[PDB]
Amino acid sequence: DAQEKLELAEKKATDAEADVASLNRRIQLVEEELDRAQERLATALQKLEEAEKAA
Amino acid sequence: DAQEKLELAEKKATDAEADVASLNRRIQLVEEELDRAQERLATALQKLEEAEKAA
């Protein structure tokens, strides 16, 4: 039982770590996409200022 | 040893869990900002369309 629990805890660690890595990938993807949304936002806001300023 | 490996693997998983949990908090917060930035962006872009119509 300790050994199976170990294989399962190791599996859980494997999966938790797979999830750490898969999420780290995803967190980074949302951080990168966030930076892009923020850059696009700064761009949209600058364009908004240009359009609004044109107006 | 199975029990120590189990406690350790449980901790590999607990730490991996703490890390994925940290990451899950980061994806939730960053992705929430991705979406808020995307929404702010959509807002800036919608405002841009209106600002351009106003232009």
Swiss-Prot record, chains A, B:
Compartment(s): Cytoplasm, Cytoskeleton
Tissue expression per record: Detected in primary breast cancer tissues but undetectable in normal breast tissues in Sudanese patients. Isoform 1 is expressed in adult and fetal skeletal muscle and cardiac tissues, with higher expression levels in the cardiac tissues. Isoform 10 is expressed in adult and fetal cardiac tissues, but not in skeletal muscle.
Family statement: Belongs to the tropomyosin family.
UniProt domain comment: The molecule is in a coiled coil structure that is formed by 2 polypeptide chains. The sequence exhibits a prominent seven-residues periodicity.
Pathology linked to this chain's protein: Cardiomyopathy, familial hypertrophic, 3: A hereditary heart disorder characterized by ventricular hypertrophy, which is usually asymmetric and often involves the interventricular septum. The symptoms include dyspnea, syncope, collapse, palpitations, and chest pain. They can be readily provoked by exercise. The disorder has inter- and intrafamilial variability ranging from benign to malignant forms with high risk of cardiac failure and sudden cardiac death.
Function: Binds to actin filaments in muscle and non-muscle cells. Plays a central role, in association with the troponin complex, in the calcium dependent regulation of vertebrate striated muscle contraction. Smooth muscle contraction is regulated by interaction with caldesmon. In non-muscle cells is implicated in stabilizing cytoskeleton actin filaments.
Subunit note: Homodimer. Heterodimer of an alpha (TPM1, TPM3 or TPM4) and a beta (TPM2) chain. Interacts with HRG (via the HRR domain); the interaction contributes to the antiangiogenic properties of the histidine/proline-rich region (HRR) of HRG. Interacts (via N-terminus) with LMOD2 (via N-terminus) and TMOD1 (via N-terminus).
Protein name (Swiss-Prot/TrEMBL): Tropomyosin alpha-1 chain
Annotated source species: Homo sapiens (Human)
Taxonomic lineage of the native organism: Eukaryota, Metazoa, Chordata, Craniata, Vertebrata
Chain's gene name: TPM1
Full-protein residues shown: 66 to 120 of 284
